[PDB]
Amino acid sequence: LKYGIVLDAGSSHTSMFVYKWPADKENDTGIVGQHSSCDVQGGGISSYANDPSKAGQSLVRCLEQALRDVPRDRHASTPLYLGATAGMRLLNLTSPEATARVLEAVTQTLTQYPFDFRGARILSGQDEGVFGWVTANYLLENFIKYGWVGRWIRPRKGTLGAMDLGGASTQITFETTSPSEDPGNEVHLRLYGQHYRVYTHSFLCYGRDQILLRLLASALQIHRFHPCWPKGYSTQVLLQEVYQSPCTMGQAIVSLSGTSNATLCRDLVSRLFNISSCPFSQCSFNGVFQPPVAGNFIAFSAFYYTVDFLTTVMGLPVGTLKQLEEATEITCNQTWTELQARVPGQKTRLADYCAVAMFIHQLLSRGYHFDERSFREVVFQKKAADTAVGWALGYMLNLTNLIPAD
């Protein structure tokens, strides 16, 4: 066996994945798998914008684990990559000098481990979307030519669309037969001798944590209470946090209480999605071109954990867009004490499930224009073939050249 390590440096958390695969048949689809993982304590690497040495340091404990997870005599030969995403893209736009110091610091730390360190890079929004789509379809074996002599399956095996909700952006990516009307959104992949025409778009500032900060700025402007927070919940909002984000530009402490108002929560949320103009033949939102969604989809990262809160803790079905919608209202309408009565556990972000759940439902119906028919093909899943679904694997597979173009 051979191994490979990806550090996924997301906006509010760094994650380490160690993959494993047989040396003797490494170019087969679905072959590479997750061997182990590690979660870094504390915030994402961009959080150390003002103390960049701490960013390299935050990675030590997990690096120590990778030394135990990867057998000694293969350290030398095992590639190590760090890919950073929207938090670092944001930090790049507000402070490119701090961004480069952060990446130098992490580079510092990584290059002294005995792995074949190949670089710390910021993924574009296209890469992020595209690599999650690769990951899903690789692990679920959709690049296989199905059938046998001469009863081949016709047409080609359909692929899975991917929706990825991270902390500072969200991505949608799917195979499409519609003409491209924007080349920024056009993707062409060559995988195992096949051509895949793919749409992808990353919405910056539309990740779960940035959505919550924008909701908090608008709740403060319009209401001076938070309709998405539960009645009997209140906190000290630090205006520094709210208004320092590049995502709220265009909006020190204030007490703020929840009111469990689903309709007004839905009003705040729906304001995130500008649908008033479209210079293309069709749009998702904010004037962005998007062809009609089609095929099966997998929705992962924070889509999964929020839906699992609804189905598990709230005990509600989310099989249809409408059950999804009713699940969000019922959650938003709970008081703080009603939430606690369901014995949900020590969830530090319990007050925000309603907002995130409402954001997801708006994003899918008002933003991406799923309806009942097309949402029937969405599954909420975080793992496939015991591997975390995200952009990490497809990234490593592309840098390591494990997928043949032919």
Ligand SMILES: Cc1cccc(Nc2cc(S(=O)(=O)O)c(N)c3c2C(=O)c2ccccc2C3=O)c1
């Ligand atoms: C790396 C890893 C592996 C297994 C579980 C987790 N926990 C999580 C990992 C992610 S991740 O950023 O998509 O990885 C994530 N987005 C979440 C979690 C969570 O555990 C989680 C728990 C409760 C509410 C929301 C989340 C959540 O959004 C993280």
Ligand SMILES: Cc1cccc(Nc2cc(S(=O)(=O)O)c(N)c3c2C(=O)c2ccccc2C3=O)c1
């Ligand atoms: C609702 C909401 C809003 C903003 C961020 C989160 N993220 C989280 C919320 C919880 S919670 O304590 O169960 O509330 C939580 N346990 C986690 C997360 C996470 O985001 C997370 C990310 C990566 C690894 C682990 C976690 C995680 O354990 C959840």
